[PDB]
Amino acid sequence: HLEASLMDALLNDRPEFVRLLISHGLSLGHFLTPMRLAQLYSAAPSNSL
Amino acid sequence: MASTGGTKVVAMGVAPWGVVRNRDTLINPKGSFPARYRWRGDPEDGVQFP
């Protein structure tokens, strides 16, 4: 319930939701599985540098 | 999280050893590990509380 909630807190920019979820605590060792990091970099904007 | 300033209140959870079920058996040399506990990994909820 908290895991996929922080994804949309990260993929959509929304940093104030990120501080809330970490305040209620996530794993970050079961959250930062390398699929989700590649998922995180996949939401970079297309016309970026 | 309510008061965002806070002072990070301190609370000692005096527990018995023979109840914690996900005991990683912290490092027998001198007990100095930063060793992380495994939290949600349990199908049991019996007399084996974390």
From Swiss-Prot, chain A:
Phosphorylation by PKC leads to increase the sensitivity to Ca(2+). It is linked to Progressive familial heart block 1B: A cardiac bundle branch disorder characterized by progressive alteration of cardiac conduction through the His-Purkinje system, with a pattern of a right bundle-branch block and/or left anterior hemiblock occurring individually or together. It leads to complete atrio-ventricular block causing syncope and sudden death. This is Transient receptor potential cation channel subfamily M member 4. TRPM4, is a temperature-sensitive ion channel, it adopts distinct conformations at different temperatures, markedly influencing where and how ligands interact with it. Decavanadate (a positive modulator), ATP (an inhibitor) and Ca(2+) bind to different locations of TRPM4 at physiological temperatures or at lower temperatures. Belongs to the transient receptor (TC 1.A.4) family. LTrpC subfamily. TRPM4 sub-subfamily. ATP 2 binds at residue 25. Widely expressed with a high expression in intestine and prostate. In brain, it is both expressed in whole cerebral arteries and isolated vascular smooth muscle cells. Prominently expressed in Purkinje fibers. Expressed at higher levels in T-helper 2 (Th2) cells as compared to T-helper 1 (Th1) cells. Expressed in keratocytes. Signal peptide: none annotated. Homotetramer. Calcium-activated selective cation channel that mediates membrane depolarization. While it is activated by increase in intracellular Ca(2+), it is impermeable to it. Mediates transport of monovalent cations (Na(+) > K(+) > Cs(+) > Li(+)), leading to depolarize the membrane. It thereby plays a central role in cadiomyocytes, neurons from entorhinal cortex, dorsal root and vomeronasal neurons, endocrine pancreas cells, kidney epithelial cells, cochlea hair cells etc. It comes from Homo sapiens (Human).
